Amino acid sequence: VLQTIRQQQSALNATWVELLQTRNTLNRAGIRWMMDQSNIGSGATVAELMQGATNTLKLTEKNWEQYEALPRDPRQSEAAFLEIKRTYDIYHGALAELIQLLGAGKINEFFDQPTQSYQDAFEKQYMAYMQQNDRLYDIAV
Amino acid sequence: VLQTIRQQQSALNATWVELLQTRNTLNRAGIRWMMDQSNIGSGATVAELMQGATNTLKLTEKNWEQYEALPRDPRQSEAAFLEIKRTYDIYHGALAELIQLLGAGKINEFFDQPTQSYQDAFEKQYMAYMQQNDRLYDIA
Ligand SMILES: [Cl-]
Ligand SMILES: [Cl-]
Ligand SMILES: [Cl-]
Ligand SMILES: [Cl-]
Ligand code: NA
Ligand code: NA
Ligand code: NA
Ligand code: NA
């Protein structure tokens, strides 16, 4: 019934949320890394933050596969799902590369990566996909 | 009645998302701020990021008022809403404080603010609130 899109919706939202939480944690580690260069570091360490980003990026993978493996209503759009996955893989892959750049100390290459564009592209599909499902709500009446 | 729920969940989830983006942009600005002090600045500038964070923090405040104005079903717990609002106000106000600290060059107070705890507290209520509406959706 209409419960199969609400459960598929919740699964993709949890991926969306974990991607954002991962990007934020990485940028915290960037500040601490910067602080350590000038020996003014305090609070959370780079290692603890990198450790947390690694965890939430794996959580992101697992949340994604949980959404992929959920059944799709025949009315939904196949192209829509492929565009979601295309933008997700770029965004997820970009965060994985940010972990490597920071570990190698490439702070400029880290900061200059156009992560915002990858995120904007995924959010554009998520929003459009949220709208098409909200319409299946309005017509399932 | 079921439509009333999906509207609330979407309005509150939009606030949740905007809070996360606001915090991330502020942490991007913190890096560039430190880059400027070390003369290795590149990418997005502090000013552009600060005006982005200022922008998204207003989207958060608006997205919240949209959720708060939507009608609450009687079956929904009033105390649950008060706890969502309490944790939201702490979290929002904390992000507003980060804008003041970074604009004042206070990078240590900026980094040391326990923002994670404010976010964890709001996410705890947000998760509990959704699981309740989901069980409510199941009954109907
Ligand atoms: Cl570099
Ligand atoms: Cl970009
Ligand atoms: Cl300070
Ligand atoms: Cl904390
Ligand atoms: Na939403
Ligand atoms: Na500076
Ligand atoms: Na910019
Ligand atoms: Na309050």
Numbering used by the authors:
A (entry chain A): 42 to 182
B (entry chain B): 42 to 181
Paper text:
To capture a complex with a fully bound ligand site, we grew crystals of the soluble periplasmic portion of the SeTsr LBD with L-serine, at a high salt concentration that would serve as a cryoprotectant without further manipulation, and harvested crystals directly from drops to prevent leaching of the ligand from the binding site. The crystal structure of SeTsr LBD contains five monomers in the asymmetric unit, providing five independent views of the L-serine binding site, with homodimers formed between chains A and B, C and D, and E and its crystal symmetry mate, E′. Lower B-factors in the SeTsr ligand binding region are indicative of greater order, reflecting that our structure is fully serine-bound. SeTsr and EcTsr possess high-sequence similarity in the LBD region—100% identity of the ligand-binding residues and 82.1% identity over the entire periplasmic domain—and as expected, retain a similar global structure with all chains of serine-bound SeTsr, serine-bound EcTsr, and apo EcTsr overlaying within 0.24 Ǻ rmsd over 139 Cα. The higher resolution (+0.3 Ǻ) of the SeTsr structure, and full occupancy of the ligand, provides a much-improved view of the interactions that facilitate specific recognition of L-serine. All five chains of the SeTsr structure are consistent in the positions of the ligand and surrounding residues. Consequently, we can conclude that the correct serine pose and ligand-binding site positions for both models are those we determined using the higher resolution SeTsr structure, in which the L-serine side chain hydroxyl faces outward from the pocket, toward the solvent, and every hydrogen bonding group of the ligand is satisfied by the residues of the binding site.
